[PDB]
Each structure stands twice: as structure tokens, then as C-alpha cells.
Structure 1
Amino acid sequence: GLSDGEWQQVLNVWGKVEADIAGHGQEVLIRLFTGHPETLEKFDKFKHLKTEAEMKASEDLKKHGTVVLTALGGILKKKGHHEAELKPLAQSHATKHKIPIKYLEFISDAIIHVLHSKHPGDFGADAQGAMTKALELFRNDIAAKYKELGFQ
């Protein structure tokens, strides 16, 4: 449950991401994969990436980063009214990709890390609070769908 002012902060922060969705998406995934190498194993199409240099050079990783952040941005712009947008992602990530909710926590924190890394001094405490709450809401609603599906 975010206030109007918190959603305003979220969407203000998101404008930073939308200016360079592929660069943000790439860095989010690289942060996820390098911080939590087990997550790489969930991607048949990225498990060949042995080094961060290879990850950085991967155009397909940037492409997927764009897909991920485009989806997330579409969800965030719903300001919590995202059941229709979230449902297929929860279902695909539980049933097809088999992504534990822990990895969604990892990527949520990776987003925060990337925002500070790319916008140092420009991702204020209020913005971090609002973005964190929005990612918690996202993760929590996914978690509810995971529970429905019995997925761990």
C-alpha cells in the first residue's frame, strides 16, 4: 500500500530508468547474476556467460533486461492495480521458469543497488523508500500467487 506521494516518487525514479531502459536492465541483470550466481542457472540462454565481461558484451542480456524492466515499468505504472499484468508473470515465473521468491528479492535489491550506482546522490532517501515499497508490493503480490500455486 503506497500513498499517492509514494507512487509519485516511484514514477519519478522510473523516469530515470526509462531514459536508458536497456542500460538499467543490463546492469540489473548483471548485478543479479554476479551477486547471486545461482540465478544465472535459471537462464538456459545466459548460463554460458562465465565472466562479467561476457555478460556486459551480451546483446541478448541487454535485450532481456529491456524485456524485464519494460514489464516491471508497466506494472509500476498501474500504481498497485496490476493484477492483470502481474498474474502471467507470477504464473510463468512459478510454473515455467521455477523462480523462487528469494530471487525476486535479489532482483529487487539489485534494482536499488543499480539506481544508486547509476544515479549516485540522485536517488534520495524518500525515493529509495518509495521504490522499495513498490518492489515489496510487487514481490508480495507475486508471493500470494506463488502460495496459491504451492510453489516454493
Structure 2
Amino acid sequence: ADFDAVLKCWGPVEADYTTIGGLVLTRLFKEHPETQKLFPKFAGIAQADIAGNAAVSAHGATVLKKLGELLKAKGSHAAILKPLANSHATKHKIPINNFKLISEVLVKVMQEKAGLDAGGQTALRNVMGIIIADLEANYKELGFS
């Protein structure tokens, strides 16, 4: 049910993955500035220059498309989430807590741009919790506790 509650507001996100993706990463870097250093192409870019950066927006679109692909499944995790855990633990070297940060940013952006109501906000937090727990289990399998 919580996947359905999020999908019923995904239309504005999928309609403009680049614009919404840029909103998400811009807001992540503003509200959680330590996350920006984890993206070495973007680390050091002054905040004023982030909203208009096409590479940032394109990266955000990639994130959102992947999340759409993980909603649109409702728990077919594996062939999709295991590679994501593998790359984020071992290539990008992202501490797991950062996923909670981007998930709260996404909740805020969907509240503002996608009509996600209070119950929808809770549903999305639930869904992101499922995703993050699976990512963490895979991090642990790789030796990243």
C-alpha cells in the first residue's frame, strides 16, 4: 500500500526527472553540505552555482529514475538494489546514513512539487526505510558495517 501511495504522486517527478532531480540534489547539498564532498565532480561548487548546473540535474535525474524503476516493482528488490548497494559501498564509498538524508530531502521536494500529503510523506518514509534496510544488509555482506 505504501508503494501505491507514493506512485499516486510520482507523475510530476517522472514528468521532469531533470528539473526535480536538480531540486533534490541542490537541496541535499544546501541542507546537508557534508554530502557534497562525496561527489568529487561537484565537491567545492559554491551553493549559488548548484541549482543551474546541468550535470547536477542530470545526476539527480539518474537517482530519481532508479528510484522510479525500485517503485515500480514494490519489492522485486534484488537485481535492482544489490548493484546499487555494491556501487555505493565500494565505488562511491557512501556511508549508509547519507541515504536517510536524501530520503528526507525527497519527501520535502515531493510535498512541494508533487502533491504528496501527510499520509503520503509517511508512506514515502516507509518505502525509503525498506530500501535503506536492504542497502544496509548488502553493505554488511560486503564488509561495510
With structure 2 as the length reference, what TM-score do the two structures score? 0.94
In structure 2, what is the equivalent of residue 14 of structure 1?
A: 10
Of 133, 148, 151, the residue aligned with 2:144 is: 151
Q: Is 1:37 aligned to residue 33 of structure 2? A: yes
Q: How many residues align?
A: 145
Q: Report the Cα offset of residue 124 of structure 1.
A: 1.3
Name segments (4+ residues, structure 1) moved above 3 Å: none
In 2, Cα distance between equivalents of 1:150 and 1:109: 26
Matches of 1:123 and 1:10, distance apart in 2: 8
The answer for the alignment partner of 2:75 in structure 1 is 80
Q: What is the aligned partner in structure 2 of residue 101 from structure 1?
A: 96
The match for 2:108 among 85, 90, 113 is 113
Please give the root-mean-square deviation of Cα atoms over the aligned residues, in Å.
1.2
Asked if structure 1 preserves the Cα contact closer than 8 Å seen for 2:12 and 2:113, the reply is no
1:8 partner letter: D
Per-residue displacement from partner, 1:109-136 (whole Å, max 9, x unpaired)? Answer: 11001112324xx321221121111111
Partners of 2:7 and 2:53 in 1: how far apart? 28
Tell me how far 1:88 sits from its aligned partner. Answer: 0.7
Matched residues, percent identical?
A: 44
Code of the residue aligned with 1:21 in structure 2: it is Y
Partner of 1:64: 59
1:62, distance to aligned residue in structure 2 (A): 0.6
3-state SS in 1 of match to 2:38: coil
Deviations 1:1-22 (A, max 9, x none): xxxx322112112222112211
C-alpha separation in 1, matches of 2:74 and 2:141: 23
Task: Please report how far the alpha carbon of residue 56 of structure 1 lies from its aligned counterpart in structure 2 after TM superposition.
Answer: 0.9
List gaps (5 residues or longer) in structure 1.
none
Partner AA of 2:134 in structure 1: D
